[PDB]
Amino acid sequence: NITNLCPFDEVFNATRFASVYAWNRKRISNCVADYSVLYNFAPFFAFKCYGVSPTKLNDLCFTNVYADSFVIRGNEVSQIAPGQTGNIADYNYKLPDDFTGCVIAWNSNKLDSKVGGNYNYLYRLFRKSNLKPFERDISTEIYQAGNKPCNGVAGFNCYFPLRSYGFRPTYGVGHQPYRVVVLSFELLHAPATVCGPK
Amino acid sequence: STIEEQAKTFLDKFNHEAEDLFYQSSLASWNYNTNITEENVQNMNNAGDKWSAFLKEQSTLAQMYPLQEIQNLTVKLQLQALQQNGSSVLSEDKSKRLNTILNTMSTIYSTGKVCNPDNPQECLLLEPGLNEIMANSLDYNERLWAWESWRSEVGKQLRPLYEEYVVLKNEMARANHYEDYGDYWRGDYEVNGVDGYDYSRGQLIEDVEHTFEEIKPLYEHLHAYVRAKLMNAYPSYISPIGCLPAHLLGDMWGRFWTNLYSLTVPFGQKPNIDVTDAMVDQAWDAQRIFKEAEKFFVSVGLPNMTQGFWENSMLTDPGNVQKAVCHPTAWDLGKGDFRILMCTKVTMDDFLTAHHEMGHIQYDMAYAAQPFLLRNGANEGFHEAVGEIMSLSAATPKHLKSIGLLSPDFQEDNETEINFLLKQALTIVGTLPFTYMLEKWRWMVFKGEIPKDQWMKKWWEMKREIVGVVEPVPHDETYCDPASLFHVSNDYSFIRYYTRTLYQFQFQEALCQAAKHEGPLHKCDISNSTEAGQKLFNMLRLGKSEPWTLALENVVGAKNMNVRPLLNYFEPLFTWLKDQNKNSFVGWSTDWSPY
Ligand SMILES: *[C@@H]1O[C@H](CO)[C@@H](O)[C@H](O)[C@H]1NC(C)=O
Ligand SMILES: *[C@@H]1O[C@H](CO)[C@@H](O)[C@H](O)[C@H]1NC(C)=O
Ligand SMILES: *[C@@H]1O[C@H](CO)[C@@H](O)[C@H](O)[C@H]1NC(C)=O
Ligand SMILES: [Cl-]
Ligand SMILES: [Zn+2]
């Protein structure tokens, strides 16, 4: 039978993804969990699963199917995983240690790169402390790197936290843009009203 | 927060912004070089000025750190490379004066043209015509007059400018807590803050003199042989026991003796190993040559080139509708963008040059994971050595016959081996004394050991003593022979061509041991040697994040420069010359002159 399948293409086939410092989160809680992600650019660069195996995923029920998305560099995809260190993992997007889900990443050079440089994607470079798991911080306050507060002005020892990317088609595979999306699954000890197809 | 955290944050921000801006500038410069147009010229110009202003303001902001409280050697080296004040230390007047002096020097050297008494309208400039004569002219008087007139025309006009440039650079470097500009140049090899691998600037001169002490015998015998062979081509002008004229070296300055092979050929009956005609018969092209170089490099164990390389790099001249500089160039635009600009033709020279450029690009990619301020070679000589070892290993007959260029029905013999070794010595070991004496003279001038009224006298005396090249005619002190060279008038260090020439053989002999070689060093091929490739990559990956001595230890196992591999390379040629250099007295008498 069929009730209504998941709008997974709405996040996998979006016209433009969101930045890392403001990564979006879409709650999928009332849809038939049809995991057929293969048709979205089957040649995935990184298709890894944490806490669940690849295909048995399609025949298991869950309460929340939260889906997070953002764009990062090709060499930064390794930071999107349980127990990782770096700029992204700590200051932009942190995954829990016992994360149960999947992480899909694919190249988006043609879409998110221009001959003149796509400076629309920003990322946090400085922060007072490391972010917690699944924490979101839009703060754009001047990071105090010196001793005085700087009164909230950009100057010496007072740098702006967010930095741009400037993706270009001539960049190397390591620096080309990579659209990444995470499929978070968690059981809240609640009745799973919806499940996947049989 | 201690100063270390502030330094780390500033260095990260600078890394990001400078990476972006340097990629922009390199892209503009590439667009200009690959297409000479006013629009691309303007793009290169504005990109360059913005990048330079960003670098200058960042260095100004970097000077706010004492650098003595920091302990991280990486941050220390990054700041040292970024905190160098440079020419801004002197007052603005001295800055403008030195900039004007440099500009006029470069323009006078480039726009220099010599009028001749043969015809009132028969002037020829340096690059074309004059070099053709100095290389292929067999007439004594013609090349003598040309060599004398070029100097009398350029050095006499540059001497008043050099008298200002020397003192200006001395007052500039001394203000930077240095002894002189010659010492400032030697700061590249300076290693401090790491016991066991440290290296002072003063040790460079001593080590170079020690290496030249061992280079001398082979060069003495080579010079004796070249002289004995030149007596037949230029009779009534050369001495049996005396030095050689300066206009019989094959070039305007005698830096390279490649043009003397046509006269000092040991066995001219058998032609040299040339695979030019063998390539056109197989319908070879730039793409095939570069793919063969790729297969050779990956066979050693190095990563294959980026996809953007084959897509963005221009490896063949599109014709005179997209005009570009035909010089072989390696372009590391940054952020994983690597390209090679070369008008690749179907010739063995183009094959070797493509191998060299591919090796340079491999080196550039090795340390790609290092900071922007450390994305460079260990020193000014390591890059060219790493690029030349590949061309050396590729030019061997075994490699040419393994890839299908040389016919299997041909076994090398001693005659062709001696010919190739001697032709290589004409440019490798034949130029070492020139570079050494030039650098020593420049150092002594910058230090002040040579008074202003003894420049040319000391220059010619050192030439006679070291290189064994006598002056053809009396030269007044208003002359300036050193300024006649490009690297001297354009304010470019020249010792790199010596230290690099030694590092070349140091690496060649260090990689042959890993490949389990069983013959002479000139027949070694690092192809299919995974251990040698990994040993080399373990050093190319470091780049500038570690001292150059430690990098040298990784490959060669020695902490300091060594010239024994250089002599081992030309050991068969040395024995052949010794066996042949007995018909006349070996050496030269500096007291004799052709006038
Ligand atoms: C110095 O800083 C760099 C970059 O933060 C770091 O990788 C290195 O381990 C530090 N070394 C020390 C603690 O001396
Ligand atoms: C590396 O070499 C292999 C074998 O030739 C090839 O399949 C692959 O596409 C190459 N990759 C790059 C980045 O050139
Ligand atoms: C390297 O290996 C290839 C393939 O086995 C072979 O064709 C080539 O002759 C070898 N080259 C040398 C000289 O080791
Ligand atoms: Cl000279
Ligand atoms: Zn080179």
Tab-separated table of C-alpha atoms in Angstrom, chain A residues 119 123 125-126 143 145-147 156-157 159 163-165 168 170-172 175, chain B residues 1 6 9-10 12-13 16-17 20 23-24 61 64-65 312 335-337 339:
chain	number	residue	atom	x	y	z
A	119	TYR	CA	30.858	34.098	-1.904
A	123	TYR	CA	31.350	29.395	7.591
A	125	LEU	CA	36.202	30.216	11.747
A	126	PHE	CA	36.510	31.529	15.328
A	143	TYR	CA	35.289	37.202	18.459
A	145	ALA	CA	40.991	37.290	20.416
A	146	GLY	CA	42.890	39.873	22.498
A	147	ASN	CA	42.467	41.181	26.035
A	156	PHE	CA	43.411	44.306	15.508
A	157	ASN	CA	42.838	41.206	17.662
A	159	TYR	CA	38.108	39.449	13.956
A	163	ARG	CA	34.339	33.700	6.677
A	164	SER	CA	33.375	33.213	3.041
A	165	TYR	CA	34.215	30.352	0.673
A	168	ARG	CA	35.153	28.639	-8.345
A	170	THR	CA	38.810	26.086	-11.420
A	171	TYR	CA	39.300	24.940	-7.815
A	172	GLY	CA	40.663	21.481	-7.116
A	175	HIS	CA	38.343	22.752	-2.468
B	1	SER	CA	45.088	34.657	26.406
B	6	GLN	CA	46.560	35.686	19.167
B	9	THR	CA	44.263	33.266	15.193
B	10	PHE	CA	45.952	35.971	13.114
B	12	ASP	CA	44.683	31.363	10.404
B	13	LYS	CA	42.856	34.483	9.212
B	16	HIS	CA	42.529	32.082	4.511
B	17	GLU	CA	42.562	35.612	3.097
B	20	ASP	CA	42.008	33.562	-1.642
B	23	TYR	CA	44.621	32.438	-6.073
B	24	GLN	CA	42.970	35.513	-7.589
B	61	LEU	CA	49.817	44.000	11.570
B	64	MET	CA	52.843	43.761	16.645
B	65	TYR	CA	54.091	40.426	18.054
B	312	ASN	CA	42.918	24.015	-17.781
B	335	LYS	CA	43.421	25.745	-3.890
B	336	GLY	CA	44.151	22.564	-5.820
B	337	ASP	CA	44.601	24.293	-9.195
B	339	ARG	CA	48.612	23.993	-14.703
